[PDB]
């Protein structure tokens, strides 16, 4: 029961962080025509990908905890359904950010190999 609570506490935290990191990526806007802003944008996004990587460990940890909870057989019908929906969401929201962050990294690095 404390498992099911420690899990759900980490889930809201990572999930919230995930909406925030989306927020951040979608505020960044467009890559600069100015090679000077671009380099800044590039070195900023590299700290973003460092941050991404660390939170990738948290997402997996919650995926492990969630799964094992299901696996114990010790969850009720509803409890299981919910842990199941939560991991869909965690999987899908993570992958959506992870892909856009990788695009951005590529577009940023490509536009600097060009211009800088």
Residue numbers in the entry: 338 to 453
According to the publication:
Dystrophin is a large (427 kD) multidomain protein expressed in skeletal and cardiac muscle where it binds to the dystrophin-associated glycoprotein (DAG) complex of the plasma membrane and to F-actin connecting the cytoskeleton to the membrane. Utrophin (Utr), the 395 kD autosomal homologue of Dys is widely expressed in non muscle tissues (reviewed) but is restricted to the myotendinous and neuromuscular junctions of differentiated muscle and is located at the sarcolemma of developing fetal muscle. Dys and Utr potentially act as cellular biomechanical shock-absorbers limiting damage to the plasma membrane with the spectrin repeat domains acting as spring units by undergoing force-induced unfolding. Dys and Utr-SR1 adopt the canonical spectrin repeat fold comprising a triple helical bundle displaying an approximately cylindrical structure of overall dimensions ∼60 Å length and ∼9 Å radius (between backbone atoms).
The Dys N-terminal (repeat 1) spectrin repeat (Dys-SR1) also crystallized with two molecules in the asymmetric unit but there is no relationship between the two crystal symmetries. Based on sequence analysis Dys repeat 1 has been previously defined as amino acids 338–446/7. Comparing the structure of Dys-SR1 with Utr-SR1 results in rmsds of 0.8–1.9 Å (112 Cα) depending on which of the four molecules in the asymmetric unit of the two crystals are superimposed in a pair-wise manner. Dys-SR1A and Utr-SR1 (A & B) form the more typical conserved interaction between W354/W324 with helix B H392/H362 and helix C W431/W401. Instead of forming the usually conserved interactions with H392 (heptad ‘d’ position, helix B) and W431 (‘a’, helix C) Dys-SR1B W354 stacks against R395, one helical turn distant from 392, and is associated with both a twisting of the bend region in the centre of helix B and a crystal contact (M387 distance 3.5 Å) from a crystallographically-related molecule. This disruption of sidechain interactions relaxes the Dys-SR1B main chain so that canonical helical main chain hydrogen bonds are formed in contrast to Dys-SR1 monomer A and Utr-SR1.
